[PDB]
Ligand binder design. Sequence first.
Ligand SMILES: N/C(=N\CCCC(N)C(=O)O)N[C@@H](CC(=O)O)C(=O)O
Lengths: 434, 424, 418, 436
Amino acid sequence: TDPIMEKLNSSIAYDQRLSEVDIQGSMAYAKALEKAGILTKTELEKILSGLEKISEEWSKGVFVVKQSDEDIHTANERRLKELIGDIAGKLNTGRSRNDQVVTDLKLFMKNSLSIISTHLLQLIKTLVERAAIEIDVILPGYTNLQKAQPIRWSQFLLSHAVALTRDSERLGEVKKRINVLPLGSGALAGNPLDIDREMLRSELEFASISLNSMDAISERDFVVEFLSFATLLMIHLSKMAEDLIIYSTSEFGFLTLSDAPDSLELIRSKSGRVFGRLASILMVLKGLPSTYNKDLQEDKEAVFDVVDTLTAVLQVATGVISTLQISKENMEKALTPEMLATDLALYLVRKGVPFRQAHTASGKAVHLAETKGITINNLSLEDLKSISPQFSSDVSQVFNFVNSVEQYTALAGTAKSSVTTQIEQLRELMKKQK
Amino acid sequence: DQRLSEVDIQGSMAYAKALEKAGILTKTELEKILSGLEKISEEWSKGVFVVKQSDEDIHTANERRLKELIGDIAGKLNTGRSRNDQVVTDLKLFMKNSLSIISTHLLQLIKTLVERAAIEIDVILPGYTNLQKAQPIRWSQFLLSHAVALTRDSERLGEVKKRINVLPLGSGALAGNPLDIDREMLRSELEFASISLNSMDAISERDFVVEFLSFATLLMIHLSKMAEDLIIYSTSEFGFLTLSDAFSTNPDSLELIRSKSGRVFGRLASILMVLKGLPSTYNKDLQEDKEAVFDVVDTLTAVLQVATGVISTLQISKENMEKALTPEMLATDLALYLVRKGVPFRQAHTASGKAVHLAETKGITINNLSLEDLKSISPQFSSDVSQVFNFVNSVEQYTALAGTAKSSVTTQIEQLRELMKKQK
Amino acid sequence: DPIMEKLNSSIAYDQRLSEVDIQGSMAYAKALEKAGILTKTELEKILSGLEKISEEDIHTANERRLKELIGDIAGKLNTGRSRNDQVVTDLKLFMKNSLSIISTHLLQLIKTLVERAAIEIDVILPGYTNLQKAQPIRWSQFLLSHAVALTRDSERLGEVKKRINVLPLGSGALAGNPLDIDREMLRSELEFASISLNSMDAISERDFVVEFLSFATLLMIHLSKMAEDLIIYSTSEFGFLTLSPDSLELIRSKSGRVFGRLASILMVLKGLPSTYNKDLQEDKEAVFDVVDTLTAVLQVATGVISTLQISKENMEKALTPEMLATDLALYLVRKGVPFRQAHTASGKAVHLAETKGITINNLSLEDLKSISPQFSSDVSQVFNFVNSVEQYTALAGTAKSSVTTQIEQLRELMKKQK
Amino acid sequence: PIMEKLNSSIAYDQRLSEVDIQGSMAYAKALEKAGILTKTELEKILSGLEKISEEWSKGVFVVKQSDEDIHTANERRLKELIGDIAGKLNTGRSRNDQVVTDLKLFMKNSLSIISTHLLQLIKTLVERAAIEIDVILPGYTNLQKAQPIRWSQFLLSHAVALTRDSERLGEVKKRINVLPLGSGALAGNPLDIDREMLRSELEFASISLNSMDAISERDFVVEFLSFATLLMIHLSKMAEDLIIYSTSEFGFLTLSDAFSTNPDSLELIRSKSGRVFGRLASILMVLKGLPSTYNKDLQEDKEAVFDVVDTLTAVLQVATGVISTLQISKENMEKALTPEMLATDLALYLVRKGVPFRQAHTASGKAVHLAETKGITINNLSLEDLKSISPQFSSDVSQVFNFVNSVEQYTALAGTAKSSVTTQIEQLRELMKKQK
Ligand SMILES: N/C(=N\CCCC(N)C(=O)O)N[C@@H](CC(=O)O)C(=O)O
């Protein structure tokens, strides 16, 4: 009576990409039905063959949807009907859309997450592979967007690599809980025909099966975990984009991007988009009583969008990180003797000069250059040697940026030895994540 | 003025022994510090301290304290160290301990549900779909569905504690530690599993905070769902069960649990926005992490225990649960009856539909229909069809894994017990 | 490569901005003529072409079918006009139109609730607190409570519509229109109420989008609550009413969908520097989805309210004597007994009752006086649900006089908000 | 014990002590008029309430572990000051219509304080825009120098966004200024209490239209949060602009030692956007799904509001100071201005000569290409170098390479031209005042 409601439950529009997983679900169920005694070796063949046909149709868009197809489910159950005959009805025996729609989603997500996984590690591998050939480049490090202290351009690219490797790790943990068979849970209390679930697992290639039908029917944990996985990933990409946006300014002049688009902006904007899907599903799920509820239908559109977003955005990021051109001279140009004010105290420290008792001489020399109109390195022992009995003719080495970075040899530091170690550590993480 | 203190002291003791191995300190100094710090941990576990107001972060409350206990020697304690890698070290140690507290309570809740399902394994009540009676299920199938979702929260918690259990200390301000400090020693002292791979990341990253909140948010969703169910079942209308009174006030205990969901979610949304737009490396913004962490930790700890209490002390009304079962609900089982006799899917329900009508037409339920009546709808109906109109039998059709048959339930209980054991 | 360009392909979902786009162009064209950048003839040219387009990204689409229709003359149309102020003019014009539609749907829902409250004013059922029977209330009081909340959404709707009804066209890329274009003429042509104050603000702000979404989410909150109530009252256990599917679940599920949009835009905006940034392109999809969601949901809600069937029988059956315990206490309060003395006197009547295994309305006058000699024989007027509800005459209460008065304050509000 | 600790609210709802007392005084008065209280009783209760009012003011009031919430604490207090008589105060009242009456009184007052601070910030922006009206700096798009603009056109774009926030604040305050008291538990007040009298005493504009709604809704809380969040988006954006601008790289400005503790103050402001957004999200999820009427879930409103009220109140004053005491560098903002940025103005030059928009830029770009292959800038090309591309190029073309003239092209309302900037200041000046 209400053309509004009908359209509201109309999903065939965006849901069709599940055509394949919906088909492989029926084939699997059919086979189990024959063993369950509901289907004969003969009927099964007729059914599989019909399902194989419709399958090959989509692979060529040849398929044709009618104006009566509510969703991908019926669209096939229909074509299958008008193909092998009324013997098409035996296939839906004992099954429900409740465990059929969740089977479809995890299969789809398990497939999609493999795609994403590939692109993600490719990105990490680009950052890492770039941090290896530009390991000598040095530029400013920031704290509240203010030149802090000297660091290697490579320590920068790897910091994003490390954050991203953790996303790959979370992805894997999410993929494992998704790789569990929900089919066979029926509409609520389970499958009433003593169907062979282990067989379904095998055919559908899941790693294991759902423990409780009610939970397997109502939980969307796998959707939320995924969205939260995707969201944290986006936070990382927007952080990277933010720095690249800043460095690519005229004012910074640190680097330039390829192309002939505004790609970095896109990457940053998608974090909100993705975040919106997380918030959406969490509120849809909050307050719902057991077991199955119409509300759970909002999961699809969210999964689809984030799936395509991460896929397009990851590849774009790889491109950027592989074609952007840095300016070693401008990154060096940015370095200043002021930044060496930190190491300055460190000189006294090794000489035995205690903490604060060493950081005092640091500021003194500064306000003094702010007095003699020079940079802390232009001074001399005909002075500094006064600010502290500790300034042999070797303190001169302190005013060298390469030596500055080389101080951080400890694990995780910016020294070339610490970086190289990181890169080897990252090749290990990847060689394992696979 | 409380929590981050004890881990802070431990953070200094470890960096001290390590500062001593770097040459910055001597056995004398090390002893006078590692004895004064221990002297401070000694006070808090009593109730002495709290002073002035120039001391911003608890760090200074402690740092500026040393000058008293010993003197200007304490200054060296921060040699090479930064407040940036020092604050994250405090947080991870805090969360590591908290996660342990929480895990204990979580597993207790799960066991409370598992243990209760085993004892009431015979009780039967209606299962719901869009809140309408759909079909008979065992009360234990209900309890176990929650317990299952909760074991996944435990798995997530474990995955989160793992990445939190990594030493960030030694990263300094952003480029690393300048004195070639021995981070391996720090790890051993503080007892982390491994050490951070990159200084800049370890300083700025707040992945560990997001994950924890994301873990806490899904746990609360699960908790708000159980609460919703019990609130509904505890209404007069349903009359399925009542709360012990200690958790009542009006099942306040349930409303509380459910309301905490948004509270916790707000924190997740909060930290995600603080991080969203931010260039590397450290930024003052990251300070908003602590209050968010502290709040979710106390909420989870309290909420989990209230939940355990409710589940173990609520009284079910087996009577009303069984009086809720109607013949109406066995219409599908009737169609299933024929299906096991070769009757096709469509015709099966078709026939069953007539049944409901033949009785819908008269003044009796489908279980009062005689063999004569059913036969006028399908010669496949035998006198044994009467075994359909038995709720015990209804539930016993689901023998396939995950189903509500008695055997499947006992299988689940055994699997969950393994799961809990695994959770250690 | 189609992996990055694909993302900027804002054409498959915003073709609905075709009409509003052409109007901005017609209007800008006229202004561009008075500015002298276009000859009187060059005007009829770059306008008769737009004439056909409407008769049949979206910008390029029209900015393409235009040149290939009137020749190269159409090129002078972009003179002094940036996409930044053109895209913002499109959304604002589009949202205004969508808000009038939405307002009409919202008004219909409110009117169906009020109208239903008028006719079913004699129905009484349990009022809940923590989903536990609290005090007897009129079914109409329940309906007017949702209607009242919805009237606040309509009020919020107008407040947002006002700030949206401001002309953004003419702000240029960011510093403004360089050709001293007559914005008053642009305003009148396009029908805005006034024009933007600062060009930078007009190019980069998306307040109007955040405001719309905040209005939409709160509105969805109100709708998900009404639905939740109707989901519970329609359960077999409650049996208060039946709907003439899963419409209720459908309405409730849309709250999160809309909340998601609010959350995403807020996150997209946070931390962006001035002035314009590509990121802002995410506003469209979110606005389109929420406009369709509200348009459909509101109408589905209206249907539900007018066609659901209540059960006067079950609703009254649900009224138990225990719900009148407070009324019992209030019986003494009106006699003169202090607050505490009465409520405890009522507490012992409920005790003395459960003891004997009866309901409080069955206690004999004798048994009551052993609890308080203040219980005259008139105490029987208390165990009456119409009398219970009729105690609440004070404005806003559930007494019949208050309900009728509410229906009138609302009847005037609907009139106001329109 | 855990349950009791988690169910308790006394610990934080203490701030409502005064508004709670004020609420009771009003009710007490209407309760006396209703006949539930005698003239003497009223005076005793009133005097008692006044005494309790001071105990909190002087910070004397003592809390008992038995105090479950601020409402109970005060009730107990009157009891020990006037005895049994104090118990008759709650007659016909509920913690349901009482708690919301309290929250609304608190928010009306807190909103007045926020309004003051918001307007002062806007005033600070406008006053500075008037004075530094000649300063010119680059305008940005995707953080790439686009076209020149006046520093004031920049300051005002922020002032304008903030005026809309002040407008939204006024709208929220209106719906909050409604009396919820007398709604009871959910069915209304049974004693026929005079609510009109209540509105008058507590100074509300109007009264609750429906009992059930008045006790279950938190619109007023969500609106305030939506108001707060959008306001923080504006402050986070300005903070982000000032952060970039204060970098050594840009060097357009620097903060005074007072705030820039590293522009710390700016980062402190930006961070709060998420903190305020979080509260918005929580309450929205807390209400979603909640059935009619009152539910314990609604208790989460208070801590959310307190956090956002104290946050905005601190952040608004920090922002005002930052804008007031910051030091710009006219020299740098001026150097940032480059000839390349005028390439477009050069294109419009021809446009103002009957030259088609098409051949206009096609002729403009070539001017950038010509000087592109000479290692100079467009302002250095010879008059002959120009006429070559388009004889339309007169001798006055020179003037185009002047930044002041660049900004003065935008005379149309809203632009960055000076006449436009002064008009804006007058409009915003008027917007405020009409505002209040
Ligand atoms: N009084 C009451 N609860 C109130 C709470 C105030 C509070 N601590 C808050 O923050 O909301 N509800 C009654 C309603 C009735 O009897 O109708 C009940 O317990 O059932």
